[PDB]
Amino acid sequence: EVAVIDAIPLAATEHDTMLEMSDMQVWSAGLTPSLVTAEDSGSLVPRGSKSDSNASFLRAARAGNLDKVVEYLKGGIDINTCNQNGLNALHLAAKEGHVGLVQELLGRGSSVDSATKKGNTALHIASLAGQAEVVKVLVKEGANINAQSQNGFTPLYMAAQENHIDVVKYLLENGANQSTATEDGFTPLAVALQQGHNQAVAILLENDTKGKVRLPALHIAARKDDTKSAALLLQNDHNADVQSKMMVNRTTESGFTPLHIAAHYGNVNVATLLLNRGAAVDFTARNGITPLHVASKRGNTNMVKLLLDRGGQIDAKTRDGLTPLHCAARSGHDQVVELLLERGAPLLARTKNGLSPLHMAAQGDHVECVKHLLQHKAPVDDVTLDYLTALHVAAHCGHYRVTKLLLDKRANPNARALNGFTPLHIACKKNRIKVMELLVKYGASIQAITESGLTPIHVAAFMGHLNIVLLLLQNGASPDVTNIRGETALHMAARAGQVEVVRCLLRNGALVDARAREEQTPLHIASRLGKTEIVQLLLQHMAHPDAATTNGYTPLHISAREGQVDVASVLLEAGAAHSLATKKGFTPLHVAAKYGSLDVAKLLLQRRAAADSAGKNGLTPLHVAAHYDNQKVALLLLEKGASPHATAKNGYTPLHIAAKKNQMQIASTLLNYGAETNIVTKQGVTPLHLASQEGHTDMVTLLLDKGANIHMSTKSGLTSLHLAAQEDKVNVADILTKHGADQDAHTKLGYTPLIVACHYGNVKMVNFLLKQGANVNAKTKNGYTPLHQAAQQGHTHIINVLLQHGAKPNATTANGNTALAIAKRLGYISVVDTLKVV
């Protein structure tokens, strides 16, 4: 996979800039007090046999008709009857200010602190509506002055919200607690401050001392620019030496000080007061956001002027290096930018990635910011760490106006970034048509290449940006320029699967059988990736279907390896040769027999492809199939008439191959097709020999079930009981004498399977041998008995068991050599000892 067609850094640098500059945002959630909703008297319709009358009674309460009400009370009407919302007669009377009705209702035994569905007492309803007189009656009758409705609202909160001075002043005098807050954390002070009721704020502040009530109020004052309130709130904040402990520098939950907040909304007036009260100009929140950053991001020109004058660091940088000049520039606040510059903000300050303020302005298509920065002599082609110019960035974003400006300001349209990427390469990758045309007009080289040899047209074709591919061709781009792999735009278009692009290049003269590395054409790549439609397209434009790679693979061979059945079909239907060979001498059928592509194999056999095609090695597809344990494909061939008696150059049949690699199923299938087992190679090898040698227990069983001789000698005189001993095949040999394999059999050098079993130290092997008729006294050609071999190689346990069976130690060779003469010749100390005990 090509990962080289990515300007890898830039998306990920936009994000770093974004999410460390999108996070300078005061969560007004806790600075905007929640406002109470008053209980709407309902239509008061019937909802019981007293249904119509309970409803008629409530309307009488709302209208303040004491007379009609008393008659209902005497008439059997329950005084606690209410509407859908839980509003009773005392609530309705309370809202309208019908004082006399209220005393009367309380007199008739109406529950005072009876609450509605929303938790409103008569006192809540009365306070919000400003019925000071109803309240005096309610307070005096012992109503709960600190009762809370559903969201935590208290009567003092409501009175402050609706600027009912007299109610507030009264509620406070009777010990109402203004510290008691809502669920979202708002106090009567906070809401009075939010509503701009300075008169109410003044009163509330006179009663309570706590900064616990005060701090959230101050933040709100900061947002609302309430200088008058801010001054009052800070009446007790004494100038201390530890700034973070002064109330004016205490933060919200977002780490923002009051000054950050004033900076955000551009509240010069409140900020000035805050600062005069010892506000810290460079207190930081989150990832190093100073107030100066915030005002800068916000374009609050006058705030910036103020913070700088108060000793605010013009060059403070965030965690990734944003200076205030970066921020104003990113946001397109040209007036703030020129100001920061004029106050001497560092013009070429860099972020972690090396972007200057000019790069930020280029991102946001901010013309005026770019003009001011260039005006103050910012290098038009100033580069980042990845060697991107402002022009590279504007092209990636597809920003026309800034691109046009930068080019007019003599930016190099061929400036090469880190990987040779030009602005034109990037514009073509991000499919930026208007920018792309603009760059060409200002002189970008149409056929410049990257460090990996990619041209603009390689890139646009690979990305499928069709309109771009066209424009490049219309501007003279050659579709035959090669990258470092030697691939053209067609190769890259085929690799990506961009069908309409492949067509376009082809209708525009692309060399169809253009050779890349390994001499592979686009037809080869399409076949490998199973791009069926593209295989048809190339073939339609005179692609030679028998074109081979360096190692000799045709697109058909490739179909066989990848199991592309559909691809294989289009090729054969185009006149693809079905029996061409690779450098290793494999036909497409062989390849299918190696990778187990059964559907491809079937399609080939139906096309007059030889089931028994050979190579330089003389191997058929069946041989191959047998080796790689491809059971179905192996079965397919036999049915399509592949000889199981087919031999290679070495002499191996398919049965031979299956025997060695323990291919049970494939071995079974061959035998069912009449595969002879008693057939030898050049050096006298049967599949029975190969099966035994590798120690394939069940395999030797199957070979003898279907007629194999257990006694066939090689050209050196070795049977399969010989080989089962040479490779310590204990299980194999134990089945072989169960079917009668003579041990007495000698080779051409006259050594029996009892000579071999003793030469490699096989204890249990020599035991079972003497158990079916083998003799310890049996000599070889040189004269060696089992005790002559067991005394030569220092086998201690084999001499012991040989002397327990009757191996005479007084036997010589033809030149006169006993077991004791070899054991003394090599210095074996416990071996000369046991030959003189027996």
Numbering used by the authors: 1584 to 1630, 2026 to 2816
Per the authors:
Using isothermal titration calorimetry (ITC)-based quantitative binding assays, we identified a 48-residue auto-inhibitory segment (residues 1577–1624, referred to as ‘AS’) as the complete ANK repeat-binding region. After extensive trials of screening and optimization, we succeeded in obtaining good-diffraction crystals of AnkR_AS fused at its C-terminus with the AnkB_repeats and solved the structure of the fusion protein at 3.5 Å resolution. The residues connecting AS and ANK repeats (10 residues in total, ‘GSLVPRGSGS’) are flexible, indicating that the fusion of the two chains together does not introduce obvious conformational restraints to the complex. The 24 ANK repeats form a left-handed helical solenoid with each repeat rotating anti-clockwise by ∼16°. The inner αA helices and the finger loops of the 24 repeats line together to form an elongated concave inner groove, and the αB helices of the repeats form the solvent-exposed convex outer surface. The ANK repeats superhelix has outer and inner diameters of approximately 60 Å and 45 Å, respectively, and a total height of ∼150 Å. In the complex, AS adopts a highly extended structure binding to part of the inner groove formed by the N-terminal 14 ANK repeats (R1–14) with its chain orientation anti-parallel to that of ANK repeats. A 10-residue segment of AS (residues 1592–1601) forms an α helix when bound to ANK repeats. The binding of AS to ANK repeats can be divided somewhat arbitrarily into three sites (sites 1, 2, and 3) formed by the repeats 2–6, 7–10, and 11–14, respectively. The interactions in site 2 are mediated both by hydrophobic and hydrogen bonding interactions, while interactions in site 3 are mainly hydrophobic.
Ankyrins are a family of scaffold proteins which play essential roles in connecting numerous ion channels, cell adhesion molecules, and receptors to the spectrin-based cytoskeleton beneath membranes and thereby provide mechanical support for plasma membranes and control the activities of excitable tissues including neurons and muscles. There are three members in the human ankyrin family: ankyrin-R/B/G (AnkR/B/G) encoded by ANK1/2/3, respectively. They all consist of a highly similar N-terminal membrane binding domain composed of 24 ankyrin (ANK) repeats, a spectrin-binding domain comprised of two ZU5 domains, and a UPA domain followed by a death domain (DD) and a variable C-terminal regulatory domain. The wide-ranging physiological functions of ankyrins are the result of ankyrin's remarkable capacity for binding to and anchoring numerous membrane targets, via their N-terminal 24 ANK repeats, to specific membrane micro-domains in coordination with spectrin-based cytoskeletal structures. The 24 ANK repeats of ankyrins form a superhelical solenoid with an extremely conserved elongated inner groove, which contains multiple quasi-independent target binding sites.
